[PDB]
């Protein structure tokens, strides 16, 4: 069984590179962030432009949805995060305390906490309601490329250019596990699997790895794509066949069979590094987005 993703929509409007795209949990929307300092909201099924959200003073590297689809949080070169009400476009809170670019962000499933990672080598945990920083973890010795809560919120996984992935106890801020691998190439992305047992980690040696972090064992590797330079998002696709999905520096989207690790599809049509991909929560839809020479988002749809 292989998918047949085909291009259905191209979404123009960002005036610099996109940094990331995320589907809302309720499946209705796609949020995009860009170096052009803006967030844009689009119809997930027809690509219809919905609105522009502004207020960051410098470009944005990441954006994430709350579990009820009502809020966004963004991470910006201006050293802040911003919490936005999606329906009104208003900035509800500005999260201050990082001393360098904020690179990555995420809500916990409860949506009362935000986790962020920054060039300042720290991971910060923020209270959504008050906007205050609850914890600063001296998480890494280089920029923090990704941060993600597990399915029950008790754990955070972080990755860094220092070559490490770390698992943290949310409540205490304490490090539960450090995953090191080979010669510790920069770790450019990480997230938990949907069941919470694995982490998918990208490294800048053109490699994705599925880890049982619980035992410290690499279960799968996904290769054949180009990833040496940028922190490119990877995903679990679970609505049809079980795929791994990633952008690539050869301007393609790659799709691998999760179990066999074979490439099952390469999506062509972007004209620059596909910095970000997202998988729709209920339909076989991929959103992909690219850097400066392209600046567009594409929506692709498959029968399986």
């Amino acid at each position: 069984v292989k998918p047949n993703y085909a291009l259905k929509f191209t979404l123009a409007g960002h005036t610099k590179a996109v940094s990331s795209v995320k589907f809302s949990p309720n499946g209705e929307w796609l949020a995009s962030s860009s170096a052009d300092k803006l967030i844009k909201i689009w119809g997930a099924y027809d690509g219809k432009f919905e609105k522009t959200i502004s207020g960051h003073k410098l470009g944005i590297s990441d954006v994430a949805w709350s579990s009820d689809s009502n809020l966004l949080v963004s991470a910006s070169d201006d050293k802040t995060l911003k919490i936005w009400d999606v329906s009104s476009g208003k900035c509800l809170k500005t999260l201050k305390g990082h001393s360098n670019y904020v690179f990555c962000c995420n809500f916990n499933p409860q949506s009362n906490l935000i986790v962020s990672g920054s060039f300042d080598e720290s991971v910060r945990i923020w209270d959504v309601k008050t906007g205050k920083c609850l914890k600063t973890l001296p998480a890494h010795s280089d920029p923090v490329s990704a941060v993600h809560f597990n399915r029950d919120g008790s754990l955070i996984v972080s990755s860094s250019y220092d070559g490490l992935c770390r698992i943290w106890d949310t409540a205490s801020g304490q490090c539960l596990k450090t995953l090191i691998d080979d010669d510790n190439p920069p770790v450019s992305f990480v997230k938990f699997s949907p069941n919470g047992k694995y982490i998918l980690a990208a490294t800048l040696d053109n490699t994705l790895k599925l880890w049982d972090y619980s035992k410290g064992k690499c279960l799968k590797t996904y290769t054949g794509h180009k990833n040496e330079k940028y922190c490119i998002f990877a995903n679990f696709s679970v609505t049809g066949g079980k795929w791994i999905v990633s952008g690539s520096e050869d301007n393609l989207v790659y799709i691998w069979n999760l179990q066999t690790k074979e490439i099952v599809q390469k999506l062509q049509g972007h004209t620059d590094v596909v910095i970000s991909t997202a998988c729709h929560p209920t339909e076989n839809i991929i959103a992909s987005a690219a850097l400066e020479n392209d600046k567009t988002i594409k929506l692709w749809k498959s029968d399986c």
Binding site: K16, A17, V18, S20, G59, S61, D62, P143, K229
Partner: peptide
């Protein structure tokens, strides 16, 4: 720009 859209310097 944005950190994610740049390479490490």
């Amino acid at each position: 720009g944005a950190a994610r859209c740049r390479v490490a310097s």
